Each structure stands twice: as structure tokens, then as C-alpha cells.
Amino acid sequence: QLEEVKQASIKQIQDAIDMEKSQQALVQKRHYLFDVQRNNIAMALEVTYRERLHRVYR
Amino acid sequence: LDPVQKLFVDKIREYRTKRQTSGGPVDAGPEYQQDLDRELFKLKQMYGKADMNTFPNFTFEDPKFE
């Protein structure tokens, strides 16, 4: 008797967990990614304004 | 003392005699120019031959991404 009950109890929550983790992951990593892709571009930018002021002033 | 400062004088009256002569290779002979040209050229070296007499212009630029 007891065997099959524990087999079901494992499988049901398992499925919850793994999907809820799969959802949560992709949301977070991309919304994070969204902003990382900024940050990359734009860093370049501030550098060149910084640099210009030195460069001309020299 | 103004035999002393006669000579401070005496050179300073050629402060004025030469300065109000001209001064350069002048009161003084060619010699100055013959260096001068080279020495001011060294200044051109001292800045590089980047023209120290033309207003410079400035970089418009981009580093790399994906």
C-alpha cells in the first residue's frame, strides 16, 4: 500500500517545483539581461565624453 | 656704490642702448639667428611638428560591442 502513495506524493510536487523554477528563472535573467545590455553600451559613451574634455584640453 | 651701479647703469644704459637699438642678432651680429632658426625648430620638436599655431580639432569615436 504505502509504496504507491509516496510515489505519487513525490511526483506531484516535483512537477510544481520544476516548472515554477523554470518560469521564475527566465523572467529574472532576462529582465536582468535587459539592463546589462544597457550598461554595456552606455559605459562606452561616458568614457568618450570624459576623454574628449581631457583630449582637447591637452 | 654707483661705480658698481654705474656698471649696473653701464650695462643698463645698454639695456636701453641695445634695447632701443634692437637686440637679437642685432647689436650683436648674425650669430643669434643662425642658432635661432634651429633652436625654435627644436621647440617644434619639443611639441612635435603638430602645428603649435593651428587650433586643434578633436576625436569623435566609438569602442566596440555586440
PDB file of N, CA and C in Angstrom, chain A:
ATOM      1  N   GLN A   1       0.819  -1.207   0.000  1.00  0.00           N
ATOM      2  CA  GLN A   1       0.000   0.000   0.000  1.00  0.00           C
ATOM      3  C   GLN A   1       0.860   1.267   0.000  1.00  0.00           C
ATOM      4  N   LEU A   2       1.713   1.415   1.019  1.00  0.00           N
ATOM      5  CA  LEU A   2       2.346   2.690   1.337  1.00  0.00           C
ATOM      6  C   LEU A   2       3.281   3.146   0.219  1.00  0.00           C
ATOM      7  N   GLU A   3       3.874   2.191  -0.499  1.00  0.00           N
ATOM      8  CA  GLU A   3       4.805   2.456  -1.585  1.00  0.00           C
ATOM      9  C   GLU A   3       4.236   3.449  -2.593  1.00  0.00           C
ATOM     10  N   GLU A   4       3.059   3.137  -3.144  1.00  0.00           N
ATOM     11  CA  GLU A   4       2.470   3.863  -4.273  1.00  0.00           C
ATOM     12  C   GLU A   4       2.066   5.284  -3.867  1.00  0.00           C
ATOM     13  N   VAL A   5       1.652   5.444  -2.611  1.00  0.00           N
ATOM     14  CA  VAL A   5       1.253   6.739  -2.056  1.00  0.00           C
ATOM     15  C   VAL A   5       2.426   7.714  -2.043  1.00  0.00           C
ATOM     16  N   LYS A   6       3.601   7.237  -1.629  1.00  0.00           N
ATOM     17  CA  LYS A   6       4.813   8.061  -1.605  1.00  0.00           C
ATOM     18  C   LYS A   6       5.328   8.341  -3.015  1.00  0.00           C
ATOM     19  N   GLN A   7       5.162   7.394  -3.944  1.00  0.00           N
ATOM     20  CA  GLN A   7       5.473   7.610  -5.361  1.00  0.00           C
ATOM     21  C   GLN A   7       4.676   8.778  -5.936  1.00  0.00           C
ATOM     22  N   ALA A   8       3.366   8.818  -5.682  1.00  0.00           N
ATOM     23  CA  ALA A   8       2.526   9.923  -6.121  1.00  0.00           C
ATOM     24  C   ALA A   8       2.932  11.221  -5.424  1.00  0.00           C
ATOM     25  N   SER A   9       3.172  11.186  -4.115  1.00  0.00           N
ATOM     26  CA  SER A   9       3.470  12.391  -3.340  1.00  0.00           C
ATOM     27  C   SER A   9       4.721  13.111  -3.815  1.00  0.00           C
ATOM     28  N   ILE A  10       5.751  12.347  -4.187  1.00  0.00           N
ATOM     29  CA  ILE A  10       6.964  12.886  -4.799  1.00  0.00           C
ATOM     30  C   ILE A  10       6.632  13.571  -6.120  1.00  0.00           C
ATOM     31  N   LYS A  11       5.967  12.850  -7.031  1.00  0.00           N
ATOM     32  CA  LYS A  11       5.819  13.287  -8.428  1.00  0.00           C
ATOM     33  C   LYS A  11       5.003  14.554  -8.553  1.00  0.00           C
ATOM     34  N   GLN A  12       4.010  14.698  -7.701  1.00  0.00           N
ATOM     35  CA  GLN A  12       3.107  15.827  -7.849  1.00  0.00           C
ATOM     36  C   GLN A  12       3.760  17.150  -7.514  1.00  0.00           C
ATOM     37  N   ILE A  13       4.464  17.219  -6.374  1.00  0.00           N
ATOM     38  CA  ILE A  13       5.126  18.475  -6.004  1.00  0.00           C
ATOM     39  C   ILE A  13       6.301  18.702  -6.924  1.00  0.00           C
ATOM     40  N   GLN A  14       6.882  17.624  -7.429  1.00  0.00           N
ATOM     41  CA  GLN A  14       8.069  17.741  -8.246  1.00  0.00           C
ATOM     42  C   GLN A  14       7.823  18.637  -9.424  1.00  0.00           C
ATOM     43  N   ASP A  15       6.689  18.369 -10.010  1.00  0.00           N
ATOM     44  CA  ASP A  15       6.284  18.977 -11.184  1.00  0.00           C
ATOM     45  C   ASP A  15       6.033  20.477 -10.936  1.00  0.00           C
ATOM     46  N   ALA A  16       5.349  20.800  -9.849  1.00  0.00           N
ATOM     47  CA  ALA A  16       5.241  22.168  -9.391  1.00  0.00           C
ATOM     48  C   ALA A  16       6.528  22.933  -9.420  1.00  0.00           C
ATOM     49  N   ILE A  17       7.487  22.288  -8.766  1.00  0.00           N
ATOM     50  CA  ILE A  17       8.653  22.954  -8.298  1.00  0.00           C
ATOM     51  C   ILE A  17       9.395  23.323  -9.565  1.00  0.00           C
ATOM     52  N   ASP A  18       9.590  22.324 -10.426  1.00  0.00           N
ATOM     53  CA  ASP A  18      10.492  22.452 -11.548  1.00  0.00           C
ATOM     54  C   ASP A  18       9.996  23.448 -12.580  1.00  0.00           C
ATOM     55  N   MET A  19       8.682  23.518 -12.761  1.00  0.00           N
ATOM     56  CA  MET A  19       8.098  24.492 -13.656  1.00  0.00           C
ATOM     57  C   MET A  19       8.143  25.865 -13.064  1.00  0.00           C
ATOM     58  N   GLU A  20       7.747  26.015 -11.804  1.00  0.00           N
ATOM     59  CA  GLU A  20       7.780  27.307 -11.123  1.00  0.00           C
ATOM     60  C   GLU A  20       9.176  27.898 -11.072  1.00  0.00           C
ATOM     61  N   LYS A  21      10.184  27.038 -10.958  1.00  0.00           N
ATOM     62  CA  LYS A  21      11.576  27.453 -11.062  1.00  0.00           C
ATOM     63  C   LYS A  21      11.934  27.847 -12.494  1.00  0.00           C
ATOM     64  N   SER A  22      11.522  27.056 -13.488  1.00  0.00           N
ATOM     65  CA  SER A  22      11.733  27.385 -14.907  1.00  0.00           C
ATOM     66  C   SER A  22      11.113  28.720 -15.303  1.00  0.00           C
ATOM     67  N   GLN A  23       9.899  29.033 -14.839  1.00  0.00           N
ATOM     68  CA  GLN A  23       9.313  30.359 -15.053  1.00  0.00           C
ATOM     69  C   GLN A  23      10.138  31.444 -14.432  1.00  0.00           C
ATOM     70  N   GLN A  24      10.342  31.326 -13.119  1.00  0.00           N
ATOM     71  CA  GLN A  24      10.970  32.384 -12.350  1.00  0.00           C
ATOM     72  C   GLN A  24      12.336  32.719 -12.931  1.00  0.00           C
ATOM     73  N   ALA A  25      13.067  31.698 -13.388  1.00  0.00           N
ATOM     74  CA  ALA A  25      14.425  31.870 -13.859  1.00  0.00           C
ATOM     75  C   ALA A  25      14.477  32.789 -15.064  1.00  0.00           C
ATOM     76  N   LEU A  26      13.655  32.518 -16.053  1.00  0.00           N
ATOM     77  CA  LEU A  26      13.767  33.225 -17.313  1.00  0.00           C
ATOM     78  C   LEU A  26      13.307  34.647 -17.252  1.00  0.00           C
ATOM     79  N   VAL A  27      12.296  34.884 -16.418  1.00  0.00           N
ATOM     80  CA  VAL A  27      11.883  36.236 -16.095  1.00  0.00           C
ATOM     81  C   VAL A  27      13.087  36.994 -15.582  1.00  0.00           C
ATOM     82  N   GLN A  28      13.706  36.467 -14.517  1.00  0.00           N
ATOM     83  CA  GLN A  28      14.683  37.242 -13.785  1.00  0.00           C
ATOM     84  C   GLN A  28      15.916  37.525 -14.587  1.00  0.00           C
ATOM     85  N   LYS A  29      16.415  36.498 -15.244  1.00  0.00           N
ATOM     86  CA  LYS A  29      17.643  36.580 -16.018  1.00  0.00           C
ATOM     87  C   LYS A  29      17.555  37.484 -17.185  1.00  0.00           C
ATOM     88  N   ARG A  30      16.383  37.583 -17.780  1.00  0.00           N
ATOM     89  CA  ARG A  30      16.214  38.469 -18.896  1.00  0.00           C
ATOM     90  C   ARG A  30      15.987  39.872 -18.489  1.00  0.00           C
ATOM     91  N   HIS A  31      15.132  40.061 -17.487  1.00  0.00           N
ATOM     92  CA  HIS A  31      14.931  41.411 -17.032  1.00  0.00           C
ATOM     93  C   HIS A  31      16.204  41.951 -16.495  1.00  0.00           C
ATOM     94  N   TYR A  32      17.031  41.140 -15.876  1.00  0.00           N
ATOM     95  CA  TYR A  32      18.398  41.466 -15.603  1.00  0.00           C
ATOM     96  C   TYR A  32      19.247  41.684 -16.847  1.00  0.00           C
ATOM     97  N   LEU A  33      19.110  40.797 -17.804  1.00  0.00           N
ATOM     98  CA  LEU A  33      19.836  40.939 -19.046  1.00  0.00           C
ATOM     99  C   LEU A  33      19.527  42.257 -19.751  1.00  0.00           C
ATOM    100  N   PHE A  34      18.280  42.717 -19.617  1.00  0.00           N
ATOM    101  CA  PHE A  34      17.817  43.925 -20.257  1.00  0.00           C
ATOM    102  C   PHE A  34      18.523  45.150 -19.909  1.00  0.00           C
ATOM    103  N   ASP A  35      18.806  45.085 -18.667  1.00  0.00           N
ATOM    104  CA  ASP A  35      19.527  46.153 -18.233  1.00  0.00           C
ATOM    105  C   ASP A  35      21.082  45.961 -18.403  1.00  0.00           C
ATOM    106  N   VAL A  36      21.631  44.750 -18.271  1.00  0.00           N
ATOM    107  CA  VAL A  36      23.055  44.538 -18.558  1.00  0.00           C
ATOM    108  C   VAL A  36      23.434  45.016 -19.956  1.00  0.00           C
ATOM    109  N   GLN A  37      22.624  44.679 -20.956  1.00  0.00           N
ATOM    110  CA  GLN A  37      22.873  45.087 -22.335  1.00  0.00           C
ATOM    111  C   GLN A  37      22.941  46.587 -22.423  1.00  0.00           C
ATOM    112  N   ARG A  38      22.167  47.320 -21.565  1.00  0.00           N
ATOM    113  CA  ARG A  38      22.433  48.770 -21.447  1.00  0.00           C
ATOM    114  C   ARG A  38      23.785  49.048 -21.232  1.00  0.00           C
ATOM    115  N   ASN A  39      24.004  48.557 -20.050  1.00  0.00           N
ATOM    116  CA  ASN A  39      25.014  49.101 -19.281  1.00  0.00           C
ATOM    117  C   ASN A  39      26.306  49.060 -20.069  1.00  0.00           C
ATOM    118  N   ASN A  40      26.399  47.986 -20.856  1.00  0.00           N
ATOM    119  CA  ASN A  40      27.498  47.746 -21.752  1.00  0.00           C
ATOM    120  C   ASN A  40      27.667  48.817 -22.759  1.00  0.00           C
ATOM    121  N   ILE A  41      26.573  49.098 -23.454  1.00  0.00           N
ATOM    122  CA  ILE A  41      26.658  50.098 -24.466  1.00  0.00           C
ATOM    123  C   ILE A  41      27.102  51.351 -23.776  1.00  0.00           C
ATOM    124  N   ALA A  42      26.348  51.733 -22.777  1.00  0.00           N
ATOM    125  CA  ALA A  42      26.452  53.047 -22.395  1.00  0.00           C
ATOM    126  C   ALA A  42      27.664  53.485 -21.688  1.00  0.00           C
ATOM    127  N   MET A  43      28.256  52.592 -20.938  1.00  0.00           N
ATOM    128  CA  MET A  43      29.574  52.813 -20.441  1.00  0.00           C
ATOM    129  C   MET A  43      30.532  53.448 -21.438  1.00  0.00           C
ATOM    130  N   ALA A  44      30.465  52.998 -22.683  1.00  0.00           N
ATOM    131  CA  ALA A  44      31.353  53.478 -23.737  1.00  0.00           C
ATOM    132  C   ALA A  44      31.245  54.919 -24.036  1.00  0.00           C
ATOM    133  N   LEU A  45      30.007  55.282 -23.968  1.00  0.00           N
ATOM    134  CA  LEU A  45      29.620  56.559 -24.177  1.00  0.00           C
ATOM    135  C   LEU A  45      30.345  57.477 -23.149  1.00  0.00           C
ATOM    136  N   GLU A  46      30.200  57.219 -21.838  1.00  0.00           N
ATOM    137  CA  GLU A  46      30.579  58.249 -20.806  1.00  0.00           C
ATOM    138  C   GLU A  46      32.049  58.467 -20.823  1.00  0.00           C
ATOM    139  N   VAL A  47      32.711  57.373 -21.158  1.00  0.00           N
ATOM    140  CA  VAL A  47      34.122  57.345 -21.382  1.00  0.00           C
ATOM    141  C   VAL A  47      34.488  58.362 -22.427  1.00  0.00           C
ATOM    142  N   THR A  48      33.831  58.336 -23.578  1.00  0.00           N
ATOM    143  CA  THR A  48      34.276  59.207 -24.643  1.00  0.00           C
ATOM    144  C   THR A  48      33.978  60.667 -24.295  1.00  0.00           C
ATOM    145  N   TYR A  49      32.858  61.001 -23.637  1.00  0.00           N
ATOM    146  CA  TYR A  49      32.746  62.379 -23.167  1.00  0.00           C
ATOM    147  C   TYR A  49      33.864  62.783 -22.216  1.00  0.00           C
ATOM    148  N   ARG A  50      34.208  61.932 -21.241  1.00  0.00           N
ATOM    149  CA  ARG A  50      35.350  62.145 -20.326  1.00  0.00           C
ATOM    150  C   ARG A  50      36.617  62.400 -21.067  1.00  0.00           C
ATOM    151  N   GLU A  51      36.849  61.536 -22.021  1.00  0.00           N
ATOM    152  CA  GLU A  51      38.073  61.577 -22.763  1.00  0.00           C
ATOM    153  C   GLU A  51      38.195  62.853 -23.582  1.00  0.00           C
ATOM    154  N   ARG A  52      37.086  63.306 -24.182  1.00  0.00           N
ATOM    155  CA  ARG A  52      37.080  64.472 -25.061  1.00  0.00           C
ATOM    156  C   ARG A  52      37.579  65.680 -24.349  1.00  0.00           C
ATOM    157  N   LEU A  53      37.101  65.902 -23.149  1.00  0.00           N
ATOM    158  CA  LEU A  53      37.431  67.080 -22.397  1.00  0.00           C
ATOM    159  C   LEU A  53      38.920  67.113 -22.101  1.00  0.00           C
ATOM    160  N   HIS A  54      39.499  66.004 -21.629  1.00  0.00           N
ATOM    161  CA  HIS A  54      40.960  65.883 -21.498  1.00  0.00           C
ATOM    162  C   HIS A  54      41.663  66.129 -22.806  1.00  0.00           C
ATOM    163  N   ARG A  55      41.173  65.484 -23.860  1.00  0.00           N
ATOM    164  CA  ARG A  55      41.888  65.363 -25.120  1.00  0.00           C
ATOM    165  C   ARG A  55      42.083  66.707 -25.771  1.00  0.00           C
ATOM    166  N   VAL A  56      41.014  67.494 -25.802  1.00  0.00           N
ATOM    167  CA  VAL A  56      41.045  68.844 -26.337  1.00  0.00           C
ATOM    168  C   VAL A  56      41.845  69.778 -25.466  1.00  0.00           C
ATOM    169  N   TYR A  57      41.730  69.591 -24.163  1.00  0.00           N
ATOM    170  CA  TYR A  57      42.372  70.478 -23.232  1.00  0.00           C
ATOM    171  C   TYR A  57      43.874  70.349 -23.248  1.00  0.00           C
ATOM    172  N   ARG A  58      44.369  69.115 -23.371  1.00  0.00           N
ATOM    173  CA  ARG A  58      45.758  68.867 -23.740  1.00  0.00           C
ATOM    174  C   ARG A  58      46.101  69.536 -25.059  1.00  0.00           C
TER     175      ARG A  58
END
